[PDB]
Design a protein around this nucleic acid. Structure first.
Lengths: 188, 315
RNA sequence: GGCAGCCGCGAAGCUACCAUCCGCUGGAUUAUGGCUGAACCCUCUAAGUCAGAUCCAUGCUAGAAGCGGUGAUGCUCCACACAGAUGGAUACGAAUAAGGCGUCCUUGUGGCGUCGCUGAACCAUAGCAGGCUAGCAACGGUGCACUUGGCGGAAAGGCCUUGGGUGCUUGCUGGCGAAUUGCAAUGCGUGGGGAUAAAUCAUUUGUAUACGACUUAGA
RNA sequence: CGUGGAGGUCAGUGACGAAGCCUAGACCGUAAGGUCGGGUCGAACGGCCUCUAGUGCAGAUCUUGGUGGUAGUAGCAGCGAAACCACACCAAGGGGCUUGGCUACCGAAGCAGAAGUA
RNA sequence: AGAACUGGCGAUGCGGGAUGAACCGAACGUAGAGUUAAGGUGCCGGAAUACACGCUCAAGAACAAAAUAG
RNA sequence: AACCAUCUAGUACUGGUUCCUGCCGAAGUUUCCCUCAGGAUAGCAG
């Protein structure tokens, strides 16, 4: 339905998000993933640092959270095939929200959120912490310039809220009229 | 194998917000080795005040001039060169570095950029303001004045030096003022300062740290090779010149040990990348006598003034 | 004192522990040492939490037969030629045992009302694949080219926006034509010349050398 | 189904082109194969009922003849082979199909002092 | 060790079981529509990130076994 | 100590055994000639 979909990785499970993205873009849907560093994995820090060195001690290994997510997505797609290679060309993963994706709406997957999937009172791991612990050196800059992203975007939202205030006032003053009642009668 | 005749600085020391804008590294050409004797003033040593004898390398360090400044944005995928800016002029040997067939080529070096600098500066000032507001890590672009060093190379080696000062606005202001200026060797290093050396061996590149500068050579004054004790009117250059090297007629640096690379090879110096706390670094290297005997062959004399003393007189 | 000969001394060289210079500093953790504190008074453990070596960072070597910036000119004539838009990817942040929106003062982790229980939402959506054209109501909405100011460095290259120009306006009232397709077949550079910015070879250079390669310079 | 030859029949086909060969052409049949479209070719061959057999090949470390990698290599600017030839880097499951990748710090110990983790 | 009584395969495709001769279904003319078996329904892979009750923080998806409800 | 031409295409287990299609289609055993050698008998399929 959407020519390009931007998915906010924060608060989502790596496995569920990877599976849903693989299924979606295997059907030709273009998907973009942002804020991968904020992606979460179930379980406390231990047993999440583990199971990574286990396969590491075997090739080339990538420490960036985006590369980890791609590897998770890569194994869920029939790579080495033209369809698999073509499907993987419709995927983009970045840390934070670099432009121009910062100026566009970002969606989430209800069936992949940690809150809706993980039972309360259970420890969970975050991709950023694991990446830093396994040698990632860009967490500091990622956080620093993500905080700046919220800066002045709060101001943009405030301006939008102010504009919508005037829009609502204009609607209300024109409301209750004959045309307004006619529209409300037809569910609009 | 090394990437080129020159080596690349892989790291720089941590920036200092309070210190003024200053350079962090210098480069020069190997000028062989020489013998020196000094009083071992190291405390708690069985050879305290003894005349320890050891070898010290000599590196020719011609004046280095600033030719540009470069800022880098701290992107999530490493540092990216935001914008490079040269300053109104490129030297003949600087231009030569950009040509493999300089003699055959039309020598069409910076022409519109030089003409661009002749404008009201708005573009250059716009880029300076950009750097001021934008990326707060800056590296200076410099070259070696090989036209002064007596070498057949005749080609200037371009190099980048990172500024260690704070208030990158001050950095760009210093660059705006010190453009196309000449920086003396003594302005970057001083005696007793610990530095590291990086070069290319006779062909891999390697780095050695914790090397003390025994003497900083101001090649403008005579008797640069004489210590406070010897204080003779002798230059570090022995009789007849140097082995496979032309002559020393400019600023030079003397470093403990032997920097990698044969004679005439270009080397770079850096301030150890950190504040070493060892007492060896802190102690000052008082100098007693520096060998100046002809290295070519077996010299029985130091300078021609005393050479005739052994023979008395000659035909 | 010839040369296919010997002797005393011998630079230059490959080279030596056979000599010389140098050869790391910040964090999370096993066990362990402790605080707060339940199951069940206590307790280092259940939720939190300080110190602490295996690991990660610093430095070092190379750089994907990956990426950024910078300088130089492609300029001209002749002859030929060509993985799936078709409504809008509609932008705060944070939690999920709490959140927004409006109001005001008690300006604070404030009181009240209001909303979720999905996007089943908002824009726009009428005119021959969207024409011609006569009026009414406002001084709005908006396509295109101009102009002013700021803003976006994470892959900014995009965001608005002061001012005027020219079209539409379906906001409202009417006229002109649709036919016959006949009952559906979805309905963009070369290959030859004119000048020239630059590379490789010739020469040389040696700080390089099994052959490639690398390192210099002469209009 | 197909071939060498023979009896019979097509008052058969054919220099206005028989056989063979080629053909990113087509038709017929479940197939052995037959037929037609186009190019070289030149003089014999075929539709059908029977008889006849030295009658149909993918190999037999098969015979004759011909040609490749090895190899412009070993070797003796030039000359120039031989052996061999089903086919071509690794992890696990399974002989070379499945899934993928180049001595320090702590605790006990009449341990006065001296002097378990890795 | 020695046998032996009936049976699966000898010459056996096809679907599932990561692959397999001792497993399960099922044994065979050429195709269409439809319904199933074992086997599965997060992706590779076609199908419910179905519904309902509890269990487990660590794997979990015959041998080192003996020490949350009643 | 050999070589040449015939008897000799000898003395039996290694290897090979050539076109298509359809139908039917077992066995690895009884037990008698006791047995290594195999014949005749018995079963399956015509």
């Amino acid at each position: 339905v959407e020519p390009v979909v931007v998915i906010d990785g924060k608060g989502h499970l790596v496995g569920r998000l990877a599976s849903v993205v693989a299924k979606q873009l295997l059907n030709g849907q273009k998907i973009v993933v942002v804020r991968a560093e904020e992606l979460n994995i179930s379980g406390e820090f231990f047993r999440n640092k583990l199971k990574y060195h286990d396969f590491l001690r075997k090739p080339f290994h990538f420490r960036a959270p985006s590369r980890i997510f791609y590897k998770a997505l890569r194994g869920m797609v029939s790579h080495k095939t033209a369809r698999g290679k073509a499907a993987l060309e419709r995927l983009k993963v970045f840390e934070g929200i670099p432009p121009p994706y910062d100026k566009k709406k970002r969606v989430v997957v209800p069936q992949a959120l940690r809150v809706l999937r993980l039972k309360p009172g259970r420890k969970y791991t975050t991709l950023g912490k694991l990446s830093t612990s396994v040698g990632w050196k860009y967490e500091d800059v990622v956080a620093k310039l993500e905080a700046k992203r919220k800066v002045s975007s709060a101001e943009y939202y405030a301006k939008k809220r102010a504009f919508t205030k005037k829009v609502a006032s204009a609607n209300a003053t024109a409301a209750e009229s004959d045309v307004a009642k006619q529209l409300a009668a037809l569910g609009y | 194998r090394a990437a080129s005749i020159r080596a690349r600085v892989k790291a720089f020391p941590k920036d200092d917000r309070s210190k003024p804008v200053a350079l962090t590294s210098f480069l020069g050409y190997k000028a062989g080795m020489t013998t020196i004797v000094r009083d071992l003033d190291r405390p708690g040593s069985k050879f305290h005040k003894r005349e320890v004898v050891e070898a010290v390398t000599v590196v020719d360090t011609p004046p280095v001039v600033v030719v540009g400044v470069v800022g880098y944005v701290e992107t999530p995928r490493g540092l990216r060169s935001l914008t490079t800016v040269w300053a109104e002029h490129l030297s003949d040997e600087v231009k030569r570095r950009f040509y493999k067939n300089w003699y055959k080529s039309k020598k069409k070096a910076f022409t519109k950029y030089s003409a661009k600098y002749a404008q009201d500066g708005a573009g250059i000032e716009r880029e300076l303001a950009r750097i001021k507001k934008y990326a707060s890590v800056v590296r200076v672009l410099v070259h070696t004045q090989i036209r002064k060093t007596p070498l057949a190379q005749k080609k200037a080696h371009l190099a980048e030096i990172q500024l260690n000062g704070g208030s990158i606005s001050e950095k760009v202001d210093w660059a705006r003022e010190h453009f196309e200026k000449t920086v003396a060797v003594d302005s970057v290093f001083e005696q007793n300062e610990m530095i590291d050396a990086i070069a290319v061996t006779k062909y891999h590149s390697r780095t050695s740290i914790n090397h003390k500068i025994y003497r900083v050579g101001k090649g403008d004054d005579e008797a640069n090779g004489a210590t406070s004790f010897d204080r003779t009117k002798k230059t570090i250059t022995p009789m007849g010149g140097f082995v496979h090297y032309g002559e020393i007629k400019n600023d030079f640096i003397m470093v403990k040990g032997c920097i990698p690379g044969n004679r005439k090879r270009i080397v770079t110096l850096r301030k150890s990348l950190y504040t070493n706390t060892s007492r060896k670094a802190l102690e000052e290297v008082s100098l007693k006598w520096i060998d100046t005997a002809s290295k070519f062959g077996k010299g029985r004399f130091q300078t021609p003034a005393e050479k005739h003393a052994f023979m008395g007189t000659l035909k």
